[PDB]
Amino acid sequence: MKKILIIGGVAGGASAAARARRLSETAEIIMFERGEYVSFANCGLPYHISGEIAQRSALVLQTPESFKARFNVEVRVKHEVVAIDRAAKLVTVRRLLDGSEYQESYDTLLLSPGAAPIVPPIPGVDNPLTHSLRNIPDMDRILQTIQMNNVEHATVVGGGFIGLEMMESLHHLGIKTTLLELADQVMTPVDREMAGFAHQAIRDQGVDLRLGTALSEVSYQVQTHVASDAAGEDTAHQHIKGHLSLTLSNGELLETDLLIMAIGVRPETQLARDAGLAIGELGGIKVNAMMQTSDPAIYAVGDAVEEQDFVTGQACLVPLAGPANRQGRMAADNMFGREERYQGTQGTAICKVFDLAVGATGKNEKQLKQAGIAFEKVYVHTASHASYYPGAEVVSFKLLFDPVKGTIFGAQAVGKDGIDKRIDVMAVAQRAGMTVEQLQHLELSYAPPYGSAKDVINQAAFVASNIIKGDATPIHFDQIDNLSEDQLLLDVRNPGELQNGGLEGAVNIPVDELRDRMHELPKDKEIIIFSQVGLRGNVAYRQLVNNGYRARNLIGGYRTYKFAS
Amino acid sequence: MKKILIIGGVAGGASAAARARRLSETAEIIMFERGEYVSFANCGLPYHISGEIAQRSALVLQTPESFKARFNVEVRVKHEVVAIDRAAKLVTVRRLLDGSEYQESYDTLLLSPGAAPIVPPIPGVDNPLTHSLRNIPDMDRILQTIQMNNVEHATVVGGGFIGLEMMESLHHLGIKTTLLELADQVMTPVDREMAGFAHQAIRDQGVDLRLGTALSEVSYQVQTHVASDAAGEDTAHQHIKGHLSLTLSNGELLETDLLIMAIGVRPETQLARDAGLAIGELGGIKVNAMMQTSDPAIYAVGDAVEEQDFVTGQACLVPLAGPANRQGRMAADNMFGREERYQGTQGTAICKVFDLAVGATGKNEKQLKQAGIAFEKVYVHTASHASYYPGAEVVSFKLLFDPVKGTIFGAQAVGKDGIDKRIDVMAVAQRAGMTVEQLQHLELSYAPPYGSAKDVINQAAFVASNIIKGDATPIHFDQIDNLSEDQLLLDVRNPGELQNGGLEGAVNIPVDELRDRMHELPKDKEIIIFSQVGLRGNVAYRQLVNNGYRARNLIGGYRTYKFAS
Numbered sequence A, B: 001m002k003k004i005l006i007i008g009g010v011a012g013g014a015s016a017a018a019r020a021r022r023l024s025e026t027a028e029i030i031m032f033e034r035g036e037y038v039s040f041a042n043c044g045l046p047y048h049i050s051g052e053i054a055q056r057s058a059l060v061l062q063t064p065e066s067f068k069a070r071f072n073v074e075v076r077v078k079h080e081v082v083a084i085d086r087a088a089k090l091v092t093v094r095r096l097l098d099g100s101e102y103q104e105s106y107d108t109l110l111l112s113p114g115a116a117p118i119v120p121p122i123p124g125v126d127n128p129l130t131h132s133l134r135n136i137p138d139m140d141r142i143l144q145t146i147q148m149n150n151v152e153h154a155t156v157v158g159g160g161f162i163g164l165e166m167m168e169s170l171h172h173l174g175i176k177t178t179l180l181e182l183a184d185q186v187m188t189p190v191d192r193e194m195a196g197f198a199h200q201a202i203r204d205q206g207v208d209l210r211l212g213t214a215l216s217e218v219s220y221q222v223q224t225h226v227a228s229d230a231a232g233e234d235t236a237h238q239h240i241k242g243h244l245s246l247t248l249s250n251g252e253l254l255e256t257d258l259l260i261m262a263i264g265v266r267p268e269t270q271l272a273r274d275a276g277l278a279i280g281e282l283g284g285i286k287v288n289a290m291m292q293t294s295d296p297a298i299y300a301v302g303d304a305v306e307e308q309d310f311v312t313g314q315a316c317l318v319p320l321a322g323p324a325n326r327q328g329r330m331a332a333d334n335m336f337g338r339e340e341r342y343q344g345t346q347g348t349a350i351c352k353v354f355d356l357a358v359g360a361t362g363k364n365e366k367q368l369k370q371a372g373i374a375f376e377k378v379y380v381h382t383a384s385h386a387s388y389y390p391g392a393e394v395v396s397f398k399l400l401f402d403p404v405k406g407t408i409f410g411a412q413a414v415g416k417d418g419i420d421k422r423i424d425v426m427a428v429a430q431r432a433g434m435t436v437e438q439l440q441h442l443e444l445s446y447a448p449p450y451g452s453a454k455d456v457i458n459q460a461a462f463v464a465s466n467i468i469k470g471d472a473t474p475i476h477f478d479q480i481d482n483l484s485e486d487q488l489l490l491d492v493r494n495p496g497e498l499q500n501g502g503l504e505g506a507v508n509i510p511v512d513e514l515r516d517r518m519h520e521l522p523k524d525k526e527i528i529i530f531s532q533v534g535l536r537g538n539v540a541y542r543q544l545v546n547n548g549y550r551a552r553n554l555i556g557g558y559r560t561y562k563f564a565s
């Protein structure tokens, strides 16, 4: 009978504990959790802060007692593993109640300790008004600062998904919010031009968005004067727990009542390092595809481990919940000798940004250039369902692919509806090894409330495939401000449309007058065409190339261009 | 110049006309439409009757004038092609204004003439109060009768998508509705236990839904007496355009003010039969995968043609717009010598039914049985997103598959949220050749507003794979009512739940007391287990089977069983 010990009681470990019971009734299964709760909804926490999830009870999905009744797993809360001795096959555990210590033997051990927020080397950042969000205790601390310090202004640093969620929650509470990101965009899984849709939605809500901007120093200032109604002062905007004065990277000062640090997480590797397990170059635990560490009796899964990138096969960190649960279930399988292999991580992700969703999978354009992987890109901006039926919303969709083999590299989407669905479709098409030309033949669900005769995905697949076959010749938003003397810029929109914006020096020939007004364009210049989203531009392009012009069409039209600057 | 002629100016024929001009500016392109409108939203029509789509103008996406300006295609509205002389490469055309006729030569011809509503042999069916819905004039006539016959009760016959949409639309107008269907279920692409969720929802809205029932006679009675205010009568509930008295097949009488006939459509084949083109056993035009009829110069697409079923490779009729649009494009590619091949049809379909969506792709259990293909199924009843974040809905999902090869045969889903997403993901996975076991590795988009850590599809992948591998043993809803003297019925829900319904004679041991209470179950019997959705049943099955019992779990739980009756 195997003695199985599991370190960490959430996404990786609890999922392995439950699976392992279903596999064998004779194994002993002990699960250690340093915190008070197991199987809590980490993803839930910014939504309880805003009150969107009303009930704190909805965040706890299992208990020590439920794990014992259902799965006969001995869960030990407030118990922290403080060392693994590999040779002896024993761990040392501390009872956080009283500081006492004991040892526990294992036959096999799973490490699922996760990742802790990153501590920055910012002077003065450790103080009573600065919090990172990882667990329920971190959440009650934030909530308790909001309450006690009468938070009217808050700053969040980092525009990854934890940050955006916390800016949103704060905003939902009526708190005036500043978000600082050092990068030129929020949400780095999508590229910068895609993130431009999210920037504009963030600023439309009145949020002070400060891209390209770092926190340099934090000054905490204790409140010495307690205003009172008794001394006939106004008490409504006092902050009795103190004040923060922030220095930013350009030396401007920001005054704030609360600071949320959300600049990423790093793998918990201290136990693993102490025990001599291999650590990878990104600083996560190194595991093979069976999820086993450098020691064959020790498995590891989740935010603590490095994963193989599905597209390139290189090491990556992707701290998400889906991979952690499925890994955990798989390590339980391996632990009973099933030899199952984890198939790599695509990085499929989605985040709510007020009314928008921002989603992606696979590799982005920054990642591909950095790895010297040659690619092409397409944009579409296609209604989320048939446009004549109410409630349809534009889906701005990016597809990244090999221009020769049609390999799918990456997809990104942003919009008010139907994003989760387009990212999932792409994630399955990529995992299944579909090329862009095969994507053409997708037969998706269409009725007018839900879809369209040609989906976002079919349209993208035609535009990308046209480029592959040489029936289209692209230029991109970053090329078109840079024209030569043998190129002539042509706006094929209607003239009414140019007052919303356009490109310096364009000649204007609406697409529906072009067949007839074409002799106006000289055949010894490469005609450089754009329309609103690309689509009219494509028709024009084809009319010109069919007549022996050299041409190019601006992919994603003026829309993509507009949001890319 | 290639001279191209196109019969039908909607989904097939218009899509070919537009692609054709993008391929060639030299080609002459003449597209005949016997009606007044090209490029109308056929799918929009029920939603306009309800007023859900307010403006009649939103149903028109192209006009003769737009098609000439944009695409230099000469559209001839009110011109019906009445004969094809294939040997001469001439068609004979009739101008409906005049009844006059002329010939027009072609180099290549495209038949996209659609499918006409089926005419049933029911006495008295042809009358001023009964209508089927194909086009805009049909729609206006339905509007006209509703207004002028002050329609207060209406009857729809046929429970496929047109009939369900017309039912919902009439309801939505305040009209009391009856829906007649001869089959034991609405919406035949899903199986009868999945339709059972839709049955309940239609009934909940107060629609008189009559399954297994046919319409045997219609009696139209003109109205002789016009009540009037001057005569001092109540004029509110009069019908001056008359009355319908229906005879049903069980002999009952139904009195109604409007009759909609929605009993399916039949391919427009007369032109092809008279011209001597091949027709299949289903009554559709027979094409190869390049969409070419038996005459290599003549192409045919859309509702008029038989297609190749994706899964079985046999002939089938699937009158849907996605395929028709993509066939039309491919036919135009083929008319310029590109030799592209259509890849078979899955039958991916979805229909709104009040708050539910009912969706499917692939083959259904009915089709599989008929064809003698060995299969297995699984159900799952999974929240549409993380159930702790509000607005999560149950997705009831059926997956069908080869129990030994893992081949995906089809998928079905019903519920109030996220049905289009799961049907699209399954259509992608089958079209890409994924097996059930490969489905377990799907990495789909999770944030609490949008998904769950393990999605509906991952949970289905797991449940099915467990059967394939021998880690689960199923019984299904239609077997559990039998049971021998060698079998003992075990309900693992809590006592409180048997309240809502249960299975007669079950022993009740709730799962979380099972491990301790187990000795109560005699090991010389196969224990037949069920819980609500089948999830606790699985935990219970594992416990018993790991203890050397014979066991089965009821797949889909009490829920799937309840809606099966």
Ligand SMILES: Cc1cc2nc3c(=O)[nH]c(=O)nc-3n(C[C@H](O)[C@H](O)[C@H](O)COP(=O)(O)OP(=O)(O)OC[C@H]3O[C@@H](n4cnc5c(N)ncnc54)[C@H](O)[C@@H]3O)c2cc1C
Binding pocket: A007, A008, A009, A010, A011, A012, A013, A032, A033, A034, A035, A042, A043, A044, A045, A046, A079, A080, A081, A082, A112, A113, A114, A115, A133, A134, A135, A162, A268, A271, A301, A302, A303, A304, A319, A320, A321, A322, A324, B446, B447, B448
């Ligand atoms: C606010 C927030 C929102 C998120 N939203 C999403 C989302 O929308 N979608 C998504 O995919 N992902 C989301 N995530 C990430 C997701 O929570 C993780 O990727 C996943 O939970 C990781 O599982 P894990 O088992 O690796 O680690 P964790 O869930 O962090 O669990 C590890 C546990 O190990 C315990 N532990 C550590 N060391 C020891 C020790 N030495 N002894 C005893 N116990 C120990 C820790 O206390 C912790 O409780 C979000 C995370 C946060 C913080």
Ligand SMILES: Cc1cc2nc3c(=O)[nH]c(=O)nc-3n(C[C@H](O)[C@H](O)[C@H](O)COP(=O)(O)OP(=O)(O)OC[C@H]3O[C@@H](n4cnc5c(N)ncnc54)[C@H](O)[C@@H]3O)c2cc1C
Binding pocket: A446, A447, A448, B007, B008, B009, B010, B011, B012, B013, B032, B033, B034, B035, B042, B043, B044, B045, B046, B079, B080, B081, B082, B112, B113, B114, B115, B133, B134, B135, B162, B268, B271, B301, B302, B303, B304, B319, B320, B321, B322, B324
């Ligand atoms: C009410 C309704 C709702 C629908 N909803 C959906 C849905 O939600 N999703 C979906 O996928 N599909 C839906 N459809 C089906 C979809 O409309 C068809 O599958 C698609 O339009 C078929 O395209 P087609 O070119 O084959 O035929 P059609 O669009 O019918 O076009 C054929 C045209 O050819 C003309 N014609 C015929 N013969 C001649 C001739 N001899 N000379 C000249 N003209 C001729 C006809 O008048 C007609 O306008 C719906 C259909 C209806 C009626």
Ligand SMILES: CC(C)(COP(=O)(O)OP(=O)(O)OC[C@H]1O[C@@H](n2cnc3c(N)ncnc32)[C@H](O)[C@@H]1OP(=O)(O)O)[C@@H](O)C(=O)NCCC(=O)NCCS
Binding pocket: A009, A010, A011, A014, A015, A018, A019, A022, A038, A039, A040, A041, A042, A043, A044, A061, A062, A321, A325, A329, B379, B380, B381, B453, B454, B459, B462, B463, B466, B533, B534, B535, B538, B555, B556
């Ligand atoms: C819930 C948790 C304890 C794991 O418990 P679990 O029992 O394995 O998980 P589930 O409820 O999802 O059930 C999955 C099992 O039910 C089975 N199943 C699901 N639906 C079924 C059904 N309708 N009929 C039969 N079996 C079903 C699956 O096959 C699977 O069993 P298997 O792994 O043996 O194949 C763990 O995921 C957890 O603690 N999560 C919360 C923390 C977390 O994930 N946070 C991430 C950040 S939000």
Ligand SMILES: CC(C)(COP(=O)(O)OP(=O)(O)OC[C@H]1O[C@@H](n2cnc3c(N)ncnc32)[C@H](O)[C@@H]1OP(=O)(O)O)[C@@H](O)C(=O)NCCC(=O)NCCS
Binding pocket: A379, A380, A381, A453, A454, A459, A462, A463, A466, A533, A534, A535, A537, A538, A555, A556, B009, B010, B011, B012, B014, B015, B018, B019, B022, B038, B039, B040, B041, B042, B043, B044, B061, B062, B321, B325, B329
């Ligand atoms: C509209 C209709 C006239 C066809 O016109 P179309 O020009 O082929 O259709 P679309 O607007 O979808 O455009 C598709 C073209 O735009 C291109 N495209 C789409 N988005 C693009 C973008 N943003 N940038 C560049 N090109 C783009 C596509 O590649 C495609 O060109 P291709 O086929 O040469 O590759 C025909 O579909 C129609 O009549 N539909 C209504 C009738 C119907 O389907 N009713 C059915 C039931 S509702």
Ligand SMILES: [Cl-]
Binding pocket: A531, A532, A533, A534, A535, A536, A537, A557
């Ligand atoms: Cl455009």
Ligand SMILES: [Cl-]
Binding pocket: B531, B532, B533, B534, B535, B536, B537, B557
């Ligand atoms: Cl259950």
